[PDB]
Amino acid sequence: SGFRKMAFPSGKVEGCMVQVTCGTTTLNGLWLDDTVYCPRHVICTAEDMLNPNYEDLLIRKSNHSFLVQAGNVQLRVIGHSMQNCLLRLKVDTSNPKTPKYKFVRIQPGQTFSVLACYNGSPSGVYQCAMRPNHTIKGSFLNGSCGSVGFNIDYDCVSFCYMHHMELPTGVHAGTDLEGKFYGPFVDRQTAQAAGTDTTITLNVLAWLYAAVINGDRWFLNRFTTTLNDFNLVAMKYNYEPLTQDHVDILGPLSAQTGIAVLDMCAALKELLQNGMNGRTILGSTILEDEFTPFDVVRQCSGVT
Amino acid sequence: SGFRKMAFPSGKVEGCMVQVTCGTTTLNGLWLDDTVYCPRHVICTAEDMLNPNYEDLLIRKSNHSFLVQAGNVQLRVIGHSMQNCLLRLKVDTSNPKTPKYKFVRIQPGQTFSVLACYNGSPSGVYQCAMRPNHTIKGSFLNGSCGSVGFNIDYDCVSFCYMHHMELPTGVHAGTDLEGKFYGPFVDRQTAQAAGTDTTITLNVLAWLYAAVINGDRWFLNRFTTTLNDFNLVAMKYNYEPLTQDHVDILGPLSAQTGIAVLDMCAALKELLQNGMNGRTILGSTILEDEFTPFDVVRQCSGVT
Ligand SMILES: *[C@H](O)[C@H](C[C@@H]1CCNC1=O)NC(=O)[C@H](CC(C)C)NC(=O)OCc1ccccc1
Ligand SMILES: *[C@H](O)[C@H](C[C@@H]1CCNC1=O)NC(=O)[C@H](CC(C)C)NC(=O)OCc1ccccc1
Ligand SMILES: [Ca+2]
Ligand SMILES: [Ca+2]
Ligand SMILES: [Ca+2]
Ligand SMILES: [Ca+2]
Ligand SMILES: [Ca+2]
Ligand SMILES: [Ca+2]
After folding, report:
1. β-strands B86-91, B17-22: how paired?
2. Fewer beta carbons within 10 angstroms: which end of chain B, N or C?
C-alpha cells in the first residue's frame, strides 16, 4: 500500500566512473571499453568559461594534457577527439567492469536515475525526470559535471544524460552521450535561462492510476470529458496538452483498473478545479508528475 | 539551489545479495564472507506462518534443505543456526565481493538507504527513515524479505535493517543484522499494529536549516522561544519533544547559518500555527522530517 520514488541500483554505473583533470579543472568521466567520455569544458580555465572557443582550445592540448584516474590506478590517454559537447579519450586499458550498455536520447517527461559523483567517486543516487523545458530538477554541486543519468533494463544500462551546468533558477542542463544538449543550451557560462515549464499530464494520470491500484479511489467521479474539453482546463492550469497517443499509452493501466482514460481525465479535471482540500494521494498532498506510466507498472506488479 | 532525497550508491551491497529457498518459500539473503543472513520465516509454509514455532521447525531441517543461489552459481550450505529472527547459513565459498562492513543498530529518526530485491536480484534503491514507532515507510512487495538497509561511510558499509513484514497500515517492520526487531513486533502473521507515529522534530529543524543554507529565509521571524514553550506546541501538533541534546546536535548548522536553534524553533512554531499558506520550502509544500542534521551536512557542502 506504499509508493516510493525509486532509483535503479547503481553498481553497474559505479564501476565506470573516473576522474578527469586538465589544468586546475576537475570533473567526472565515463569509462566504457577503451574510451572515457567527459564534458568538453574540462579544458577551459576560469577565464575561458565565459566564451570558450573549444576548437582552438583543444588543438592546444595533447594526450598527456589529460590526467585520468580510476581510483588509485592512473590511465594513460592515447587519443582524443571532440564529439559535439563531449570529449572522447582513448586509454590503453579496457574497463573490465564495462556493463552491457546502450546510448539513448530520452524524451521529455521520461524518467531516469542519476549517480551524483565528485572527483570520480560516486556519492549518491536519485530519480528524476526530463522536464518539458529540457532541464532536470537535480542536486548538483561543483565537481559534479560528468555525472550520468541512466535506466537499466534487464542487464543493459541505457545511458541518457551527462551533467554540464546549472541554470540561474537552480535547475540543471546537460547532454546525451553523444554530447548534444537537451534543450536550447550551450556549454558556455553566458546568460542562459530555462524556458517556461509545464506539468507532465501523462505522468500525473499514471500516478492517479497508481493510487487506484494501491487501493485509493477517493478522487474518482461519475463524470467524463472529451479530450478537447480536458485540454481547455489543462492550459488554464499549465498542464501539457493530452494527446490521443497519451490516451493509448494509458491503455494497460486503464485496463487493469477498469477506469477509462477520459474518466480519469474527468477525475483530474475535478482535482485541478477543487484542489485536494486536505487529502493525500499515495502519501502526497500534491499532484506528482515524475512517475511515468512505465514506472507505475514496474513499481507495483499485480497487487490490483 | 536544489535538494533531493538521495540514496547511497548501492554497488557494494548489490554484490552481496543472494536467493534463499526452503520448500515453496523464497526470499533474499545477505552473503558476507562465508555466511548468508536471511529472515527465519523462510522455513515456514503458508500454514506455518500464523503461529510458527521456529525451534521445532528448524530442528526438522538439514543443510540440504536450504538452496542458496548467487546468480547462476549455486552455493552449498555446510552449516546453519538461528540468531533471534535471522538464520545464519554457512557456505563453502567466501563471497569475493564482500565489502568492508559493520553491523549497526540504528536509532529512531535516523535515515538509511534500502536496496529492494526480488529473487536475489536488486530492483531499486530509495532512502528512508526509522519512524519513532519503529516502522519504515517502505515500498515492498512479496519476494522482498531479506532486502537490507544500510549507510555507507568512507569505504565501510554499515548494515542496519533487514526486511521481514508489512503491517496492516502499509508500513514495514524488520530487524537489525542480529535479528532483533526494531519495535514491539514479532515474525508471525498475527494481528500486529503500528503504534501511533510522531513527526521527527530534530529532522524538520535540520531541514529548515537546509532551506536557509540553500538561500531561503522567508519563514524566519524576530521571535524566540524557550524549550518548554516550544514543546507545548509540539505536543499539540504531534511533534516529538525537543531536548537539550537535540539543540546541541543542531549547533554546527546554527553556527553555519547564524540562526540560534531556539530562534529556528520560534520559526517552526510559527509555521505549525500559521501553515505554509501556499508557499514551499526547498520545493515542498509540507514540513519534511526524513532528513537528519547529518544528511543536510553531506548534501550541501559549504555553498552557504
Ligand atoms: C560542473 O562541475 C559544473 C556543475 C555546476 C556547478 C554547480 N552546480 C552545477 O550543476 N558546471 C559548471 O560550472 C558550468 C561550466 C560551464 C562551462 C558550462 N557553469 C555553471 O554551471 O554556472 C552556473 C553555476 C552556479 C552556481 C555555482 C557555480 C556555477
Ligand atoms: C517477505 O517476502 C514478506 C514481505 C511482505 C510481503 C508484502 N509486503 C511486505 O513487506 N513478508 C511477509 O509476508 C510476512 C511473513 C511473516 C511470517 C512475518 N507476513 C506479512 O507481511 O503479512 C502482511 C502482508 C500484507 C499484504 C500481502 C502479503 C502479506
Ligand atoms: Ca555543438
Ligand atoms: Ca531539444
Ligand atoms: Ca475531443
Ligand atoms: Ca526472538
Ligand atoms: Ca525497540
Ligand atoms: Ca525551557
Report:
1. unpaired
2. C
B299: amino acid identity, one letter:
Q
CATH number for region A11-91: 2.40.10.10
Does residue A132 contact residue A109 with C-beta atoms inside 8 Å?
yes
Beta bridge partners of A83: A86
Declared resolution, Å: 1.9
CB B185 within 8 A of CB B172: no
Residue with cell 531499486: B124
Instruction: Compute how many other C-beta atoms are within 10 angstroms of the C-beta atom of residue B198.
Output: 19
Distance from CA of A244 to the nearest CA of B (A): 32
Which technique was the structure solved with, according to the deposited record?
X-ray
Q: Are strands A156-166 and A101-103 parallel, antiparallel or unpaired?
A: parallel
Report how far ligand 2's centroid is from the alpha carbon of A206 (Å).
26
State the cell numbers at B216. 531561503
Which value, to the nearest 10 degrees, does the dihedral of the CA atoms of residues A148, A152, A157, A158 take?
A: -70
Measured CA to CA, the distance from residue A29 to residue A33 in angstroms comes to 13
Q: Name the residue among B302, B296, B6 with its Cα closest to residue A115.
A: B6
Interface test with B, best of A1, A3, A4 (most B CBs within 10 A): A4
Amino acid at A208: L
Name the 3-class secondary structure at B102. strand
A191 lines ligand 1 (CB under 6 A): no
How far apart (Å, rounded) are the C-alpha atoms in residues B88 and B79? Answer: 8
Q: Does domain B201-299 fall into CATH 1.10.1840.10?
A: yes
**Residue B247: all three cell numbers together:** 539543540
Q: How far, in whole angstroms, is CA B288 from its chain's centroid? A: 16
Cell, residue B303: 555553498
Residue located via cell numbers 474518466: A263
SS3 B271: helix
